[PDB]
């Protein structure tokens, strides 16, 4: 059964290598979450540093692709960094060729097209990663676009990825059923980050210290990650309410 080793069709029309690349996605046992505010897009991800010998500041799955675009990865770090470097290069070339900043959704499509090629061409394996791109696009506004090893991509009101993704997804669904809107109706990004952490706590059922989390925030004209103390400041605000 060599149809399970390379990306050719099985008798039932399936691509097992693509399917097994999806299972590699959860190999890190980390859950990520993305939501949109009025002015911003917040992405949060769990940060698990098991080894005491690790430098915790170097353990990251969130990447600054361009000044405006950020990307969080669900999957092994080697494939994650592979995707990040390509995304950075692609976004840089786009700006040089076309005279304006690459939109989040266009970069998502481009990375999805590359992923599609690996599902069709035999010599290239799929990357075992799911890429969540975030920005505040100058035309579309706050944006979340996600890519997988199948080469599929779509825009989101909000999204979650990881082993316990379904719990977080339904938690978010239920909130947007209640609020009746496409986003978090909040002025400051600080409170959208607070919302993101609050709803992750409820869905996962765990408490977080400042070192158990990783936060990326996209605003107009810049995407940035938060320090441990920025997150601690945010955790204190949640606790005092």
């Amino acid at each position: 059964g060599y149809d399970r080793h390379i990306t050719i069709f099985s008798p039932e029309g399936r691509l097992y290598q693509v399917e097994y690349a999806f299972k590699a996605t959860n190999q890190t046992n980390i859950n990520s979450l993305a939501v949109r505010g009025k002015d911003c897009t917040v992405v949060i991800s769990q940060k698990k540093v098991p080894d005491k010998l690790l430098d915790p500041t170097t353990v990251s799955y969130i990447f600054c692709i361009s000044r405006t675009i950020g990307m969080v990865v669900n999957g092994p770090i080697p494939d994650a960094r592979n995707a990040a470097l390509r995304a950075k290069a692609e976004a840089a070339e786009f700006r040089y060729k076309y005279g304006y900043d690459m939109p989040c959704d266009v970069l998502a499509k481009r990375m999805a097209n590359l992923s599609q090629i690996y599902t069709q061409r035999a010599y290239m394996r799929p990357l075992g990663v799911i890429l969540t791109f975030v920005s505040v696009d100058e035309e579309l506004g706050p944006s979340i676009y996600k890519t997988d090893p199948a080469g599929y991509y779509v825009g989101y009101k909000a999204t979650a990825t990881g082993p316990k993704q379904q719990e977080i997804t339904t938690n978010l669904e239920n909130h947007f059923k209640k609020s009746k809107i496409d986003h978090i109706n909040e002025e400051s990004w600080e409170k959208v980050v607070e919302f993101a952490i609050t709803h992750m706590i409820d869905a996962l059922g765990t408490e977080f210290s400042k070192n158990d989390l990783e936060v990326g925030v996209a605003t107009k004209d810049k995407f940035f990650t938060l320090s441990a103390e920025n997150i601690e400041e945010r955790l204190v605000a949640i606790a005092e309410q």
Binding site: R4, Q27, D79, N82, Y123
Partner: protein, 243 residues
């Protein structure tokens, strides 16, 4: 099955068994370590003396990249040399275009992407080495450890090879007992102790100690081998602790 017969093939778990098999080759190799300190990094490695006929001090295993980075590895030694040769090419082209010597995090990703590339195709074999490396740049000291999969992180201390668990335990004690920081000269001594303690897991053949270091104050930010008086002093410190 047969999922383990070809590199770059995902098993139903989502694993690349060929990389995991390369890790077994690393675990079989001799012990090597890295200790990060106040203003630099220290590298040390176990050299098994297979025979009396080996010329002492003359089968050097630690390698320099550029003038500020040191690299040591465990596993298939030729594979390690290939990785350093690439590292040197990467560092040269960086310095050529950007003038400044390659930063350690930048250098770490260059090796990382290259090793990761050898997990993408069935026409190449993964690297049979875990590589501990680092140095001093404009942002201070950095220590890294890179594995066959292409995975790497920054470390306070790092260890790999047959005595990795022994060395890791010993590294964790130093991190706990010295929250403010370890000095370069202290880290050289500790490196000697840890290699001697990690030698218990490879104690048939006796060994030869090899140490190197980069420090902003002690070596002026350049990679140097520890030799002569400083080496013998570090050996003696280690000999006193095992007894």
């Amino acid at each position: 099955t047969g999922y383990d017969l070809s590199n770059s093939v995902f098993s139903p778990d989502g694993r690349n068994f060929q990389v995991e098999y390369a890790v077994k080759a690393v675990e079989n190799g001799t012990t090597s370590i890295g200790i990060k300190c106040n203003d630099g990094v220290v590298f040390a490695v176990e050299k098994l003396i297979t025979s009396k006929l080996l010329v002492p001090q003359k089968n050097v295993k630690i390698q320099v990249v550029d003038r500020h980075i040191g690299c040591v590895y465990s596993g298939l030694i030729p594979d390690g040399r290939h990785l350093v040769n690439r590292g040197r090419e990467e560092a040269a082209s960086f310095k050529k275009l950007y003038k400044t010597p390659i930063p350690i995090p930048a250098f770490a990703d260059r090796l990382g992407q290259y090793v990761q590339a050898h997990t993408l195709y069935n026409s190449v074999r993964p690297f049979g080495v875990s590589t501990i490396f680092g140095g001093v740049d404009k942002n201070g000291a950095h220590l890294y450890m890179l594995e066959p999969s292409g995975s790497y992180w920054g470390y306070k201390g790092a260890a790999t090879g047959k005595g990795r668990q022994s060395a890791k335990a010993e590294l964790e004690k130093l991190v706990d007992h010295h929250p403010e920081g370890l000095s370069a000269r202290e880290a050289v001594k500790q490196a000697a102790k840890i290699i001697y303690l990690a030698h218990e897991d490879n104690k048939e053949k006796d060994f030869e100690l090899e140490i190197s270091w980069c420090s902003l104050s002690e070596t002026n930010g350049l990679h140097k081998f520890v030799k002569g008086d400083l080496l013998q002093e570090a050996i003696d410190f280690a000999q006193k602790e095992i007894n």
